[PDB]
Amino acid sequence: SNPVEEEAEKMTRNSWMMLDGTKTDFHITVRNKSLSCAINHIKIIPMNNIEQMLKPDYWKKMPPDDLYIMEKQLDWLSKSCVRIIKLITFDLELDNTAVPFNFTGFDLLIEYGMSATDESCIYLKKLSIPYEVTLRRTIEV
Amino acid sequence: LLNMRLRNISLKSEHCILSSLDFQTSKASEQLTKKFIYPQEHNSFLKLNFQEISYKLIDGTSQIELDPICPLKVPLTAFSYDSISATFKLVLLPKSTQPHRVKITLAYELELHPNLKLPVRTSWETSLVNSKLSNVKFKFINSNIKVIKGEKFTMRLQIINSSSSPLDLVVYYNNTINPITLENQYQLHNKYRKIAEGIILLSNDYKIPYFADLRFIGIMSGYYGTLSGLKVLDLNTNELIEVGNGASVLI
């Protein structure tokens, strides 16, 4: 047998406009039992996944049936932006959920943060945070 | 057996949990050393508290108490510092450490050094308004936040349904004095008069068919806790249920 040492390592409804969020959560026992933060993350805006999905899917405009986007976009029916913090509660974590460029049949952003201050450990205990939101559409042409 | 210590924890449910330790002078120990102190011509003790610290008991952790503290020394007294916990959801009783350092004193020397640490669990443990029929939960999206100044304002009754016939009901305010130990008659009359006459609800039988705005104007002052009157009514016989929630100072 060969072991080694055990290491010491809200459903918002935004109506097609800008918004905000705030996250200060004490699910951060991943280095020395939730002492403090490694380094900050001052209000990271999440709208870039659905920007670079909702732009080129309707800028496909090649033959759309052969699916050069060949993998299924069932995991792109949410957003799941990420904030992997560097080497108590969550110090700074805000996100401007801007629905002003968004689809009409999506639900959430399962936002996963790699909580560890673990220098190249390949170990980082990533805890995910959901939203389970709903969109009330205001206008169509 | 020189300074009796106790920790009291109060559960503020709309915030963090608050727990305060409390030092005291332990009189059944003070008359002991008072006898030998007035034998050596001294009236009261001079115990010096030089390092007082509460640490979050874990594998290893520590906290910091929620105001400032110097390095103090008192004769026959009691002190009590407060440190904020984190309000747990269910079933995790946290523990703390609470170390201290009493330094006794004598004639400019002979400071008999003492130290103490009593580690224990910091769990004393003694706004959604549900429909109570079919989980049609209501919550104001800005409850208990309103400093109006006898101006108009708008609120947000975010109704959360079963999404099964979601268009059913109507709000109203009932500006009528309810018809009710003689000063127990008068306090109930002043409560029922200031409830039913102080605010107006400019959208009266608004007939909501899942947000709302509900503009009020509010023509008298005073802290209106719990905002009574603002009833709803639904498709069945009498779902006359309250909101029971939200408050507004009007000055």
Curated annotation (Swiss-Prot), chain A:
Subcellular location: Golgi apparatus, cis-Golgi network
Segment forming the signal sequence: none
Family: Belongs to the TRS120 family.
Miscellaneous field: Present with 259 molecules/cell in log phase SD medium.
Assembly behavior: Part of the multisubunit TRAPP (transport protein particle) II complex composed of BET3, BET5, TRS20, TRS23, TRS31, TRS33, TRS65, TRS120 and TRS130. Interacts directly with TRS65.
Function: Specific subunit of the TRAPP II complex, a highly conserved vesicle tethering complex that functions in the late Golgi as a guanine nucleotide exchanger (GEF) for the Golgi YPT1 GTPase. TRS120 plays a role in the YPT GEF activity of TRAPP II in concert with the two other TRAPP II-specific subunits TRS65 and TRS130.
Protein name: Trafficking protein particle complex II-specific subunit 120
Species name: Saccharomyces cerevisiae (strain ATCC 204508 / S288c) (Baker's yeast)
Span of the entire protein shown here: 822 to 997 of 1289
From Swiss-Prot, chain B:
Record localization: Cytoplasm; Golgi apparatus, cis-Golgi network
Domain of life: Eukaryota
Quaternary assembly: Part of the multisubunit TRAPP (transport protein particle) II complex composed of BET3, BET5, TRS20, TRS23, TRS31, TRS33, TRS65, TRS120 and TRS130. Interacts directly with TRS120 and TRS130.
Remaining remarks: Present with 1660 molecules/cell in log phase SD medium.
Role, per record: Specific subunit of the TRAPP II complex, a highly conserved vesicle tethering complex that functions in the late Golgi as a guanine nucleotide exchanger (GEF) for the Golgi YPT1 GTPase. TRS65 plays a role in the YPT GEF activity of TRAPP II in concert with the two other TRAPP II-specific subunits TRS120 and TRS130. Involved in cell wall (1-->6)-beta-glucan synthesis.
Protein name: Trafficking protein particle complex II-specific subunit 65
Organism of provenance: Saccharomyces cerevisiae (strain ATCC 204508 / S288c) (Baker's yeast)
Lineage, top ranks: Eukaryota, Fungi, Dikarya, Ascomycota, Saccharomycotina
Gene: TRS65
Residues of the full protein shown: 212 to 559 of 560
